[PDB]
Write a protein that binds this ligand. Structure first.
Ligand SMILES: CC(C)(COP(=O)(O)OP(=O)(O)OC[C@H]1O[C@@H](n2cnc3c(N)ncnc32)[C@H](O)[C@@H]1OP(=O)(O)O)[C@@H](O)C(=O)NCCC(=O)NCCS
Ligand SMILES: C=C(C)CC(=O)O[C@H]1C[C@@]2(COC(C)=O)[C@@H](C=C1C)O[C@@H]1[C@H](O)[C@@H](OC(C)=O)[C@@]2(C)[C@]12CO2
Ligand SMILES: [Ca+2]
Ligand SMILES: [Ca+2]
Length: 435
């Protein structure tokens, strides 16, 4: 009953090996509630799958051979997205353990809380690759819900949209006309192909071609971010105009990471900042589109230049690449190039990134997960975290922005960079180490 080709941009072999994971933590007053929470989610899963069968599907890659990396599509699998129910109460994280340590990354082992791993290591192209998987974990005093999305099938914006709709389905609210439209948008049409196009310099950053490290959460108060944004605004351009909180925080991290790396790299070492960008707005596509519609902006400089310039100069680099005409062009050029490319081996969103000196950041600040209750009766989440996976130097995320305005960055860096950052006086003025 369905055969849905992925977004041409989602046909990148890296995206086809990745699951995006997100965990929502809730307190549970009484364990008598657990079976009720399970039943409520099961019924939302059915309700969502009845309106939108494909959410329950699987990703299949057809026509692989030497010279052809294949074409992927969503096909039937089970009747609902697979749900794992895991009782950790019988040593797992507890709600009180989580509260006292500040809901640290340490305590969100993907092996413990998630139904599948982020990276395609271990088992299991004849193994199932579901579009969406859920794990409901029982913990002492609480509940962790973890949601997995196959990355070629969805970016985190699209996963959040699906999760929002599962929450509606769980409290038996009908989907609007608008939401049905977005869920049903033709993925092939979403990025219009360019009529005449030959690949040139615009796709360089997306065409090419391990040291001891860890992961840590860092938190930024609304007040620290407000001061960061002001200090960027106070030192702007002035081609622009304005910078956002997200711009300033991204710039402060590039400067700060650059700064500490001056202890181990030449001043003139090239540094590339890669920053994820939701392409839904610029493409003229509904914000509720569930697919993969993302690109990155790229920023090349040198470690010493970035560390030693005003924050406004750094934030401006970032804001300047958000020109809508340019984002569209670059994205449509990518889509056109890939459409006509049988072997997509050299294509990657981080093709030219160097783990030693780059930064690869994805801001999930705008995702709405702090708002979903799922009819569970537990209120809104107490914590929204991205589970920990293997150390991956220079890879970074911002978590969905807490309703109070707090930001948290999930940061991976090699040990000496991590320890120099944590000890950095200017960094710790604004950033609190959670771990
Ligand atoms: C690129 C991106 C990170 C930037 O986020 P952002 O800066 O918060 O959002 P916008 O670019 O839309 O700007 C909105 C902000 O700019 C401000 N702003 C917008 N226009 C303005 C103007 N004309 N004058 C002054 N301020 C303005 C807003 O007040 C808001 O600022 P605030 O958050 O500091 O209060 C974000 O748009 C994005 O694409 N996020 C998703 C990344 C992604 O795909 N990751 C998922 C991985 S699968
Ligand atoms: C191991 C890889 C395939 C490369 C990589 O860094 O992966 C990151 C980056 C990224 C996907 O990378 C590629 C090459 O497809 C995604 C997930 C992971 C694990 O997170 C973030 C985001 O969801 C992706 O876009 C991504 C580029 C990211 C950093 O911004
Ligand atoms: Ca290149
Ligand atoms: Ca290059």
């Amino acid at each position: 009953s369905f055969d849905i080709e992925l977004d041409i941009i989602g046909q990148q072999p890296p995206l086809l090996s990745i699951y995006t994971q997100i965990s929502l933590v809730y307190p549970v007053s009484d364990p008598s509630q657990y079976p009720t929470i399970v039943s409520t989610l099961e019924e939302g899963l059915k309700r969502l799958s009845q309106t939108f069968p494909w959410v329950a599907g699987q990703v299949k890659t057809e026509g692989i051979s030497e010279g052809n990396t294949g074409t992927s599509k969503i096909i039937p699998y089970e009747e609902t997205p697979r749900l794992v129910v895991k009782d950790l109460r019988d040593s797992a994280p507890t709600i009180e353990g989580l509260r006292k340590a500040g809901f640290p990354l340490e305590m969100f082992d993907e092996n413990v809380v998630a139904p599948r791993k982020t990276l395609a290591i271990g088992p299991g192209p004849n193994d199932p690759k579901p579009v969406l998987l859920l794990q409901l974990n029982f913990i002492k005093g609480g509940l962790i819900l973890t949601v997995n999305g196959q990355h070629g099938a969805m970016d985190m914006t699209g996963q959040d949209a699906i999760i929002r709709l599962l929450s509606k389905a769980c409290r038996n609210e009908s989907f609007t006309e608008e939401e049905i439209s977005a869920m049903n948008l033709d993925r092939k049409t979403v990025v219009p192909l360019l009529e005449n196009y030959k690949v040139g310099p615009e796709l360089d950053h997306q065409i090419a071609k391990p040291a001891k490290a860890t992961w840590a959460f860092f938190s930024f108060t609304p007040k620290a971010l407000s001061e960061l944004k002001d200090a960027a605004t106070k030192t702007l351009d002035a081609s622009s105009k304005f910078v956002s909180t997200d711009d300033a925080l991204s710039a402060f991290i590039w400067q700060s990471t650059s700064r500490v790396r001056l202890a181990r790299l030449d001043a003139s070492t090239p540094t590339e900042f890669c920053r994820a960008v939701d392409m839904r707005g610029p493409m003229g596509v509904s914000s509720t589109y569930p697919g993969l519609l993302q690109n990155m902006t790229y920023h090349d400089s040198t470690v010493a230049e970035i560390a030693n310039e005003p924050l406004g100069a750094t934030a401006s680099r970032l804001r300047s690449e958000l020109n809508s005409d340019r984002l569209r062009r670059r994205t449509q050029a990518l889509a056109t190039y890939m459409h006509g490319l049988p072997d997509k081996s050299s294509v990657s969103l981080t093709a030219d990134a160097n783990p030693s000196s780059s930064i690869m950041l994805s801001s999930w600040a705008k995702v709405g997960c702090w708002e979903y209750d799922f009819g569970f009766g537990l209120g809104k989440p107490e914590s929204v975290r991205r589970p920990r996976f293997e150390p991956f130097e220079s890879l970074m995320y911002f978590m969905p922005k807490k309703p109070d305005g707090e930001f948290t960055a999930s940061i991976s860096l090699r040990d000496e960079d991590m320890e120099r950052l944590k000890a950095d006086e200017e960094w710790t003025k604004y950033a609190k180490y959670i771990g």
